[model samples]
Target: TGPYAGAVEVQQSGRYYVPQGRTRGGYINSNIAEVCMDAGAAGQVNALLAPRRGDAVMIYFVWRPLRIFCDPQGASLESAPGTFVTVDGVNVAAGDVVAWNTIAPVNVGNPGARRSILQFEVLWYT
Candidate 1:
């Protein structure tokens, strides 16, 4: 949203479109919390939120920078991305083994895991 090289008067409407943002790998890109990115599974059964290779996650909270990153390791939602507990306030106890999947679940496991290598695109409104 810059490089304003005109007479400082009129501006092109769509020529300078960014992701409507500036951000990274599901990891925090700014001082704010929304910017973030992820990772993996199984140290023959690993820890939670630990990053692995394909735990690709992106979320928009209060909408800015659109945080994105792969969790650095483990198998929690922050890492493996299984479905959230259906009932709110249902406690997910410590050392509870659970399952998770990418935004795109596949045979190879993830959005772009096996071919075309992949394509990742996201858009939203708050």
Candidate 2:
């Protein structure tokens, strides 16, 4: 065997930290695909990337100021459910839903729903 041929394999495994980027500022944020929330599913547009109540992340509704709202768990359209947060806006389409734990599987007005998709962006810090 050569003097500087090879090295022995060591059993080593540990955690590591890698920075994302300067713009990200040690956090990773991304946006979901444009989703259409209508009365198709009884007004509960399931959020594929639904965020919990206390997750260290921020949710934003991008583009289109559609009149809608969200509930923590589930919602019933056509009628007034329990506690719910509304994001009713004008048709100017230049508003931002900037708040944490507000953008869930949103609830839309049944039949008379907007039938328009919304872009939800999530900025996570955890």
Candidate 3:
């Protein structure tokens, strides 16, 4: 061997760094704060990946099964009365890593009881 063996390089699309903070009232995970994103066509909240037309995006979030909730605006781990997306077959826990596809445009609204400040990241390949 002259120099060294073969090497492998890895590159990531982007990262979203979140600091721990106190969560707002009217929320289940109030201990967790809120993360907001810039306004977009369908409004802005906070998403792991920003998928373009025809582009596939993966969304990862740590959610509690019993605390899952959904609303007209978006989905979150807040109060009840909202629909819950079935995570069947996917073994996820309270802080487990979960992923989903960005097949369609996601609509996000204001950060409130319906939102949580969970860490999120996105890796896009064009």
Candidate 4:
């Protein structure tokens, strides 16, 4: 038996929104685990979270600085696009394969000309 067997679910449905230079936000359980963004057309992007607690969150993007913000008293933020690393607290080094019970959450802020896609996945261990 696996530790996270059947411990994954779509806590928050995926979304595709037109960028208007405004802050787009969402949540995944009490603590967000992963955040992913597909550039589609190369542009600035940002991911925002209200608040929560956890080890740290991971942010990944295609060809831009993965921007992520957390509540001052909540969880910290870390990002690595090409290498697929998230928070500095969680050391996901190069060429390391990490798997979570849930899929990573993705969000695109400014998708330039093409349509950007965002996905967020949350997992809980029992």
Candidate 5:
């Protein structure tokens, strides 16, 4: 079997990752963390897979952004943590995983040069 045998591939962003095989209740889950743009220049990805037998699927989402450090030591800019990202009209902090139920679209954005990673995971459920 291939490395990504049982995981449902992320529809957008060609980047998908999941290790577990298909289980009894649900299949393997996969996620992607793509870089988000700043403010009005927000970046978007086609998240969520249309449920075949159901109306909607539950998705795991996480929003986070890179932190910027000024040239305090004259070493130049740096990124660590702490930032903002708005998704589906909700602003989420760094490292917060949320469970959303709906077919609504997902969007991620940062204030300044800071960029965030939009993670979406789908656990095939019946």
Candidate 6:
């Protein structure tokens, strides 16, 4: 007999996840953290699968910045975290708020760099 010949059938909630919107076409999950400049979208990804000790093969993903966006005069995070906290003290009067030009040596004390927050997601399969 096959392995499941005597086993009872069972089921779990099958589902789908993405930024909640009407089922649409040509768009990825809303949780994605990076964006393609041309088709511009913000998103990130988390891995949910990898081989364990019992398995010989394991695949892991590493995120290395392919490119970064930096600017001297630009926008700011509306709700970015302590991400704006001052790292090195340059202007004590301004407090720890990181501005758009924070790291720009050419523009020391300039409003530090500000970029949009990243979005991402994780998927599980059986």
Supply the global lDDT for candidate 5: 0.39
Once superposed on the true structure, which residue ranges of model 5 sit more than 4 Å away at CA? 1-29, 36-40, 48-56, 66-83, 114-126
Candidate maximizing lDDT: 5
Predicted candidate 4 versus true structure: per-residue lDDT over 1-126, tens digit per residue? 222123345233233322453333344344432333333333222233212124333323222233443333434333324322343224344333334322343223433432222333322233
Candidate 6 lDDT at 121 equals: 20
Candidate 5 Cα deviation (angstroms), residue 32: 3.1
TM-score of 5: 0.43
Ranking of candidates on lDDT, top first: 5, 4, 2, 3, 6, 1
Off by over 4 Å in 1: 1-90, 104-126
Writing each residue's lDDT as its tens digit, candidate 2 over 67-119 gives 44332233422222222223323221234544434454344332333232333
lDDT of 1 by residue, 54-121 (tens): 43343211221111222224212222233122112232222343233223221111122111111112
TM-score order, best first, reads: 5, 2, 4, 3, 6, 1
TM-score of 1: 0.14
Overall lDDT per candidate, in order of appearance: 0.21, 0.31, 0.30, 0.32, 0.39, 0.21
- In angstroms, give how far residue 100 of model 3 lies from its true place: 0.5
Residue-level lDDT for 83 in candidate 6: 23
> Which scores better on TM-score, 2 or 4?
2
TM-score of each prediction: 0.14, 0.32, 0.25, 0.27, 0.43, 0.16
